[PDB]
């Protein structure tokens, strides 16, 4: 409800909206189980023909990356 800032551009608006959902995104990520979340993320992207092996295991602050559309089923 704060009209305290008005937006120069697409990215400024988009980020302002995005940062608002994080109170919900936290709650979903607290209780889902990350291995599913990542599995779905990699699946909606067509990447590397949808599933491929990983030689190396490397965790990339994946907590802030994950889309809500990935989080919901896992929860």
């Amino acid at each position: 409800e704060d009209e305290d800032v008005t937006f120069n551009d697409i990215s400024s608006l988009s980020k302002h909206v995005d940062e608002g959902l994080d109170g919900y995104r936290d709650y979903l990520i607290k209780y889902s189980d990350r291995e599913l979340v990542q599995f779905f993320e990699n699946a909606q992207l067509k990447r590397q023909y949808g599933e491929e092996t990983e030689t190396v295991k490397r965790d990339k602050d994946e907590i802030e990356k994950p889309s809500i559309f990935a989080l919901l089923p896992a929860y």
Partner: protein, 130 residues
Amino acid sequence: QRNTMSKKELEVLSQKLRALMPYADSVNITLMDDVTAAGQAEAGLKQQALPYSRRNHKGGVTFVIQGALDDVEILRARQFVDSYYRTWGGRYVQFAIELKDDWLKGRSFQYGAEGYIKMSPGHWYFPSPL
């Protein structure tokens, strides 16, 4: 090169050795060349095709053999070194043999004078010049 003695001193040395060895009638002292020793060492490593590095010191030469050697290489090296040691002993030339894994475990890195190691995408280490 590394010994400075007179003939008299050498004779005295001879006689004292003879006193230590009551079964020997005499001890013959022979002067050998350091350059010869070092050269025969390096020639043997080339002849065996082993990869190596050489380091020089005021009183010694060190050959460092390190990495992921194959079992044939390890066999050859063990045989050669064992032969050399029995001829020249271990005082002047030393052979350092080290099996070890590939450097930095298969991380990627920037190896200049300002190098660094990637831990993961998004993560830099900057530990030392590489």
